Amino acid sequence: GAMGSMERASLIQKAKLAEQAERYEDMAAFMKGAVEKGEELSCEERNLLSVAYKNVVGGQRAAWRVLSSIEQKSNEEGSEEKGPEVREYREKVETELQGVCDTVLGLLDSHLIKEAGDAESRVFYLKMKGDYYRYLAEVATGDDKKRIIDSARSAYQEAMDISKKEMPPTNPIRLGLALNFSVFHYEIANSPEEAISLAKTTFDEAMADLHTLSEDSYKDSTLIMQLLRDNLTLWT
């Protein structure tokens, strides 16, 4: 690791600077270095890690979608052959995306998840595991596509089971997990009815628990609840 010689605290500080500078590849490298120091991550640090890689892979996903769309048009009946270049470059971006996903999954497996005992850390990491298998599933086409999908499902399901036992229904981690698992059902698993059921039940159970919350916790929970509603509006 090229960050092995830098202090953990300096890596975290520089991750925060990189975020302010919108340098998310640097942010991700700094937070990978911090994870590789071997200590557990605090709540703030977990969110720095997730923000960094979400921005990196989010850009890769957007590029992949543009290129895949161009590639499909080039393969429609009537298109003028423009050679291997579109496929090659889509493949290049796809391989870089898979590499980022594999890196994140590797950090979770070595050894963030196995040391995560509290619900807020363990659910957070298992949600990430589901998310990054989901991104692999978005581009998968081979002998292991079903196994990638099932790896996403299994991670989301373990996270869900813990969240329902250990977190209130308004906990924003629980809400964001359900939001993303619902999108997994809709977009990956071809299970729109499960997606809709999960989003609606999550929203309604959260609504009923809002009365227990402070103003600041209310704002956090209702933010994610609005995303659940937005998706339900898109889907119904």
Binding site: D131, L179, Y186, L227
Partner: peptide, 5 residues
Amino acid sequence: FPATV
């Protein structure tokens, strides 16, 4: 796209 966080 649908929303994820």
